[PDB]
Amino acid sequence: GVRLSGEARKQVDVFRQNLFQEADDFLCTFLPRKIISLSQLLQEDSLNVADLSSLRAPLDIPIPDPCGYLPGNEKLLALLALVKPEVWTLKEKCILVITWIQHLIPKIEDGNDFGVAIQEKVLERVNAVKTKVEAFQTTISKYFSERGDAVAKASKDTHVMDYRALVHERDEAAYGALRAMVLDLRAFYAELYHIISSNLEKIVNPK
Amino acid sequence: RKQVDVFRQNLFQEADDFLCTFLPRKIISLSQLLQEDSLNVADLSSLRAPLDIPIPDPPCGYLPGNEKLLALLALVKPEVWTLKEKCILVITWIQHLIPKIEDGNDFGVAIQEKVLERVNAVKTKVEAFQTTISKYFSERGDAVAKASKDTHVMDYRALVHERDEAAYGALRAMVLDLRAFYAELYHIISSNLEKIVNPKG
Amino acid sequence: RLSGEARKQVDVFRQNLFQEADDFLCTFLPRKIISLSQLLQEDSLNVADLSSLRAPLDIPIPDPPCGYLPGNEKLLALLALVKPEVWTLKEKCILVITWIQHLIPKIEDGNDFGVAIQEKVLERVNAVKTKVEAFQTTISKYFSERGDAVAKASKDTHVMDYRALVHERDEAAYGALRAMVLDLRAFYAELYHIISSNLEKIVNPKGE
Amino acid sequence: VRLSGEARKQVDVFRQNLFQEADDFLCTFLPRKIISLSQLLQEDSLNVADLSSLRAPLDIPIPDPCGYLPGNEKLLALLALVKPEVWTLKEKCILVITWIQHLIPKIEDGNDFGVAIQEKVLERVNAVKTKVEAFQTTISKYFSERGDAVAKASKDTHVMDYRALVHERDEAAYGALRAMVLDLRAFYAELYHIISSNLEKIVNPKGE
Amino acid sequence: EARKQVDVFRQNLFQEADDFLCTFLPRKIISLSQLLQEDSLNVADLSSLRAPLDIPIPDPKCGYLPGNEKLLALLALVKPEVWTLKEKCILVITWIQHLIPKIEDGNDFGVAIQEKVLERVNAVKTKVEAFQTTISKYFSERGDAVAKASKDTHVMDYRALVHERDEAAYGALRAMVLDLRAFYAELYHIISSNLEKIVNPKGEEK
Amino acid sequence: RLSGEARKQVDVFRQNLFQEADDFLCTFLPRKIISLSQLLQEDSLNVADLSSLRAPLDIPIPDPPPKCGYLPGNEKLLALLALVKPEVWTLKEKCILVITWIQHLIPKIEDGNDFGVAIQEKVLERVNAVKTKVEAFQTTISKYFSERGDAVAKASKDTHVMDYRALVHERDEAAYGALRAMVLDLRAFYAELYHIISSNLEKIVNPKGE
Amino acid sequence: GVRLSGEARKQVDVFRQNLFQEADDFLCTFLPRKIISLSQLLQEDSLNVADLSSLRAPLDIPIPDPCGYLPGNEKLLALLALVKPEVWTLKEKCILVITWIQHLIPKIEDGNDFGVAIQEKVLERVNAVKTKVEAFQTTISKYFSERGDAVAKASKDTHVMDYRALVHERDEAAYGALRAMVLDLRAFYAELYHIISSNLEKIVNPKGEEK
């Protein structure tokens, strides 16, 4: 096996035990609560807007004839403050599930290959949600810089009505994407639960 | 753990509702949209918007966006989003129908993964549509901004009208694709549903 | 599962699509094939001297110690001929795709070979669509690039290379647009031949 | 569904016309071309001993602690020789492609080996077309890059490296354009040999 | 003579790796999980992260604009941890590769295990190098953000994003520690459970 | 094969090419292999102190509380470039020659005796990999002048930054090192081609036998 | 077989023999000396800095209230002059090992495939080392242009402290990377020795021709 000190084995163990308890806690209590909590958030009015013109923020740019203070969209900011911590907390939980399943990978042995193949499939699935979640964060970072460059272009060049029209469009595009984000996150949490739950037997001992 | 059940049951009802009522209605509704005149323009020169940029002479006002395209965009744009949403719904549905990974009877699960990868390919194309729409406003904006700043170059003017034609053609292709996508999903799921619900039997 | 409204709504479209595809294959495709090959005969697409393509460039030459700059009319007139042909094919590619996919049967273990034929024809049509979309991005590339070319040539009057490239873009576009028609003809022809020769298996991969 | 008397006859006229075109190209055109460029390779403009003779005058005032700058004539004259050769091959690549694809038979389980030969020759011709299109993007790269080079060299007079590179681009272009002719000769030659030696199997993969 | 100089390094490396695996790794695993307990890394209200901006609001030249202190203090904690792991990844790599035997036709399975563990460690190094490029991205991006916000005072979205970058950095830096803990943990478990086969893929004794 | 004396005229090219390739392989290649390895002995390519490479910069240093003269190129690098640059082009040309040669030796695609043709394709893909690397060298050379130019242009415009000045000298060192590696590679490439073709020539000329 | 001119066969042989001697010389004498020499460099204080704040170079940019010549970080420059020639010399030796192993590839023959497979594995490994070492050169080139653009931005916009902090950060980022470089280079030389040494038997004759 592996060489270890009397102190070194105890400090490996405390973490291992703490992690396993964390994962078993997350799977049983946290995940079902979260699944519901965001589906309940999806009921809230800010995420179910009928007329997308109500999203539109005031622009106050002087129309030319043949600059003051331009505020950011409040509605999107309030929405962002709701979805944004949810993205981060899932990414964190993805890492937790990954650390968990990998500590359940046994000694690479020629006997009984099928069991370990299941573990690798569940693991590659969790990695695929993490990848998508990280793709969400890069969509959020894309919003502020792009809306900023949009209003900066619209104010500098007052004569072009297309620059003005895109700023409102970015807000609609962000809104729609942020709505899709919650649905995805709900589906991701749901997907993880179902894949792990149904296969847990084999996941804990592939042998 | 009965708090997980309400969602599961609610989702299954949602998916079965979408497949039976929503999808056929949508399929028709956009094919009916394709009949409307705004999407079947004979002369593409009628699309062209006024430009009002002063021509220089050898020794600016306000430039409006294309109304016709804006009105068209307001029709296709919510259709793109609603499909992307339904793609997620179908995905969540099929994945909850994936059984315990078991050595017995591999063939059934292989069918589920094929239908799933197909829906993902539709979502990928739909997300490619949204990035085409986002590309329109910034590109037409930079086009008129360049055309107004440099009045002497007439190809800058000619491209603004070209972007509108390029957008129109793309937006027309979008509806056809969306119709085909909804149709494709229905047919793939319907014909295989038997195996999709229980790959094991 | 089916409902009273759903039964009708799916069938009408299905029947309408099949009729559309069978109509396209029999009448439209042969007519197109000829119509563009007849276009290829026209003089605007068979220019001997490419210097005749060259458009006037109104730029003052500097001396050692600007007005209107119009686009190339000849290319514009050519573009108005090829451009709708690119779009109409892309549309027909989608039609053929929707058609073949509605002919894909239940995924079944019995008789795998037939379905393999369907997927090959389908991947071929997708490869044609990919090339057609590559044509549209070549057309979009022309106006922005010729624009930046004349804008650079006017701003910097001293460089003769900028002036030389504007005329070169027009020649490069012309040659590409000529290649486009040839390709489009070949694509329509290729589709007809692949579908026609295999239609038997395409409609029923299983038999009976 | 069988086609009308005018419909299939119009599919036939093109088919027959294409086959005649391809058989004409293979027998007469290709050998003539192969020689014609190899004869071009003999010409002095393409075999320059001293590459400093390529160098064009720059006339930019040296600073102490602008007029109009002409393009390189020698390269322009060379370009006018290689450039139509690139386009004409790209066109012929499309012709060979349309030809071989009309020779692809019904996808059938019997005798797979023959069709595999057809696909190999076809993928080879596609690889030649890809390289030819890579040549056109090298030519387009020349004018914009030499233009930006002289524009930078004139704006910032104090830096010699800008001036040095303009002459370097011309040498880099020359060398590339020389390699282009060799490649085109080799491509035409390669096509002839691959098609000629395998023609038997190319026309009928099934045999008989 | 040449073998004597290769030997000292070889022996020194093996001792280093065996030292790292037994003493260093478990201590590190704990030390950062203990860091994760600290308050600077568990902030409830992310608005407390927000740094003062002092840019004059226009009405219908510029003062000194400092960087965020809270992020700087956090960076000084995560940043040396990223580098030290990258270093240890190289150490494990050098170790396992010196344990690769003569390529021989007999008993292929054992060497296949070694290559799998090795490709895993390389994947960890790749992710760690992706972390360094995220840190380098922070300063240049926050800099361009405040530079844009000061130059164009009128546009709020520039000012709002500077605070957003700090939140985005914070969240990423938090994820970094979690990942690093998981990486160290993952390496220990993969090596420990397979060590037998890792030292001798062939199976020998003397 | 319907008409024309021009079939005796695809023969002239074929024969001319084969003679060219056989000439290149026997006489040219060994001479080249040596000639560059002899170049590698020359002092300009074996510089001890890389500070001797450094070219004068003459940019006025600012003073804390005035436009530049003429800024020459690095002569040492220019002289080196004039030696490596024609060698890169001549190899790229010879790669095309070897390619045209081996492809004319590919026989009728036939089911009988597959192994022989597999050898031909391996040698061919190898020569293509050499050409790819040689074309990567030309794009490194083109990168030098534009990058050194933008470097001095930035250094002169902004006099106050010493790192802009420092990188110009660094590009010259980076170019030198790369150009040295280039000749080593070219020697190795010529050597590699000779060995791969020579040892396998038997199978390369007739993959079938007979 | 291959046809040869008397002069050409002499000219092919002299190089062949010279290369083999070079490679055998490199493997036996150079490589062990290098392995040690850098690991001895790793002991030196400039590469083992406790406080990374000591790396920080003076910036002299006037703080605004609501010019000058800015020198390059000497410490990094002195470090660069140490690692930089080591990167180049390894890249050169990678080419040498490659030329060597490829001249040991025999006639492609159907008999005894296993031996040649070993040669290709060692070769692809050396190529992977060369790739990483070319990735190091592009990291070094990245340093000067990036630090330059950093101080140029920091001087132009005096009011933004983030630009000023990043310049010091690049130096720390470079230092850490340059430290990792030496470790990697040591590991690369070591890795090459071990892979070649343990397999040399098969590397010289994959066919198992009697010694």
Curated annotation (Swiss-Prot), chain E:
Q: Which GO terms describe its cellular component?
A: proteasome activator complex
Q: Name one Pfam family in it.
A: PA28_N
Q: Which UniProt keywords apply?
A: Acetylation, Phosphoprotein, Proteasome
Q: Which InterPro entries match?
A: PA28_C (IPR003186), PA28_C_sf (IPR036997), PA28_N_sf (IPR036996), Proteasome_activ_PA28 (IPR009077), Proteasome_activ_PA28_N (IPR003185), Proteasome_activ_sf (IPR036252)
What function does this protein fulfil?
A: Implicated in immunoproteasome assembly and required for efficient antigen processing. The PA28 activator complex enhances the generation of class I binding peptides by altering the cleavage pattern of the proteasome.
Q: What does the subunit section of this Swiss-Prot or TrEMBL entry state?
A: Heterodimer of PSME1 and PSME2, which forms a hexameric ring.
Please report the name of this protein according to its UniProt entry: Proteasome activator complex subunit 2
Name the source organism.
Mus musculus (Mouse)
Swiss-Prot record, chain G:
Q: Which UniProt keywords apply?
A: Acetylation, Phosphoprotein, Proteasome
Q: Which GO terms describe its cellular component?
A: proteasome activator complex
Q: Which InterPro entries match?
A: PA28_C, PA28_C_sf, PA28_N_sf, Proteasome_activ_PA28, Proteasome_activ_PA28_N, Proteasome_activ_sf
Q: Which residues carry this modification: Phosphoserine?
A: S5
Reading the lineage from the top rank, the first entry is Eukaryota
Its BP terms in the Gene Ontology are: antigen processing and presentation of exogenous antigen
Q: What induces it?
A: By interferon gamma.
Coiled-coil ranges (or none): none
Family in the record: Belongs to the PA28 family.
What does this gene product do? Implicated in immunoproteasome assembly and required for efficient antigen processing. The PA28 activator complex enhances the generation of class I binding peptides by altering the cleavage pattern of the proteasome.
Question: What interactions and quaternary structure are annotated?
Answer: Heterodimer of PSME1 and PSME2, which forms a hexameric ring.
What is the recorded name of this protein? Proteasome activator complex subunit 2
Annotated organism of origin: Mus musculus (Mouse)
